[PDB]
């Protein structure tokens, strides 16, 4: 109640308005998503919480495509995530029509990024409050990026977020360190499943449904695909192995 909590038509004494700070805090009590960068691709995984037997398995999906080769998953407030993506699409299509090429990940990042920054310089236009793990492959490699509430983004090589962040990040850095970057795309699927399974240990008063995807240069042939069938059964096997089972 200072006008640094009711308006963003000013600069704050903390260099940010309170409501943007609050967006960052609400990502963390949320749902877990990770992103694994590897030497030929990226892998995405997200924990989908099960609260009832009334939900249907994989007919609600959280990982949504932009283009055909960039995969987007996000954690945090559901409505804000729809709106971010809808925008993400309009940029992506405009790029494909106008330059006659699929869009680069550092390019795509600058376009969403500038739009998250816009909604954070007006006194009555809502901030975003999702952290988006996104990425894909283009004509000079694979890239993993993570976008925050505040409009903050950098390239990542491993990324983690959510309730189970602490655990997740621990396993994830160990494995990334051990590996040249993450080893094969294939190996990374199983690994990814272990992190999500391990993070689920931080919330056993609910169930999960493991959901993975990938986007890999020679291991999806440039496309983003959902991870399913055998490839999903195998990652499950590996996961229940280490975390006892």
């Amino acid at each position: 109640g200072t006008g640094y909590d009711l308006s963003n038509s000013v600069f704050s004494p903390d260099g940010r308005n309170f409501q943007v700070e609050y967006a960052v805090k609400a990502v963390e009590n949320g749902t877990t998503s990770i992103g694994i960068k590897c030497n030929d691709g990226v892998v995405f995984a997200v924990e989908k919480l099960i609260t009832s037997k009334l939900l249907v398995p994989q007919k609600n999906v959280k990982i949504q495509v932009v283009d055909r080769h960039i995969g987007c998953v996000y954690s945090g407030l559901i409505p804000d995530g729809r709106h971010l993506v809808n925008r993400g699409r309009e940029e992506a299509a405009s790029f494909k029509k106008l330059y006659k090429t699929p869009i680069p990940i550092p390019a795509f990042a600058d376009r969403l990024g500038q739009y998250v920054q816009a909604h954070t310089l007006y006194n009555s236009v809502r901030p975003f409050g999702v952290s988006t793990i996104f990425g894909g492959v283009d004509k000079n490699g694979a890239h993993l990026y993570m976008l925050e509430p505040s409009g903050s983004y950098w390239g990542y090589k491993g990324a983690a977020t959510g309730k189970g962040r602490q655990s997740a990040k621990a396993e994830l850095e160990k494995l990334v360190d051990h590996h040249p970057e993450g080893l094969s795309a294939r190996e990374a699927v199983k690994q990814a499943a272990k992190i999500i399974y391990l993070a689920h240990e931080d919330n056993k008063e609910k169930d999960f449904e493991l959901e993975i995807s990938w986007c890999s240069l020679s291991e999806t042939n440039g496309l983003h695909k959902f991870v399913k069938g055998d490839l999903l059964q195998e990652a499950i096997d590996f996961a229940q192995k280490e975390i006892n089972g």
Binding site: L98, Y99, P104, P106, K139
Partner: protein, 205 residues
């Protein structure tokens, strides 16, 4: 409505060689039968490693190219270095929506260090076409046989330098709206090298 109209040297090319592309042109503007320009710079940088040859109407090509220049500067700073194919689309878009006033025959040729040298040829009305080499203008039909037969990939710089000087010097002779200097542009990763040879030189050589 433009009163009078303008024309360029109409035998333009981009040739692939050992380490990139060498881009070659004749230059001459005439306004009717008045020789508006002996020499011209129609050897146009649209980015630091991606140049083009402009042909067609002087007023129109220059007006387009400036717009392409603005998009590809902004494009570099934000979204990373262009490609030959990226430049080519921007040129095309501007021609197609305004093909009601525009006459632009464009070769955009640029060097990338993971595609090697690239030639994209955008005729009148505007459509992107990828080819491993190009000849354009209206004098190109007449050298189609030469060009196809002596076109060879990975030819020595000395040999390509002769080949372009010769290719044009023959074209310029038999065609009539061609004339003025032959200027050439070597694009490799070491940078951009500029060649100019005057009339008295090339005819002879």
């Amino acid at each position: 409505l433009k009163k009078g109209e303008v024309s360029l040297g109409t035998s333009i090319m981009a040739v692939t060689f050992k380490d990139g592309v060498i881009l070659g042109a004749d230059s001459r503007t005439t306004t009717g039968a008045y020789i508006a320009n002996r020499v011209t710079d129609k050897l146009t940088r649209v980015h630091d490693k991606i140049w083009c040859c402009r042909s067609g109407s002087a007023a129109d090509t220059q007006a387009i190219a400036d717009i392409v220049q603005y998009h590809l500067e902004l494009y570099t700073s934000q979204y990373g270095t262009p490609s030959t194919e990226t430049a080519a689309s921007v040129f095309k878009e501007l021609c197609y929506e305004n093909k009601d006033n525009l006459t632009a025959g464009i070769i955009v040729a640029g060097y990338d260090d993971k595609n090697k040298g690239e030639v994209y040829t955008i005729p009148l009305g505007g459509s992107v076409h990828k080819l491993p080499y190009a000849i354009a203008g209206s004098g190109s039909t007449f050298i189609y046989g030469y060009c196809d037969k002596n076109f060879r990939e990975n030819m020595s710089k000395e040999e390509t330098v002769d080949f372009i000087k010769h290719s044009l010097s023959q074209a310029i002779k038999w065609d009539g709206s061609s004339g003025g200097v032959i200027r050439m542009v070597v694009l490799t990763a070491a940078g951009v090298e500029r060649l100019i040879f005057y009339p008295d030189e090339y005819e002879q050589l």
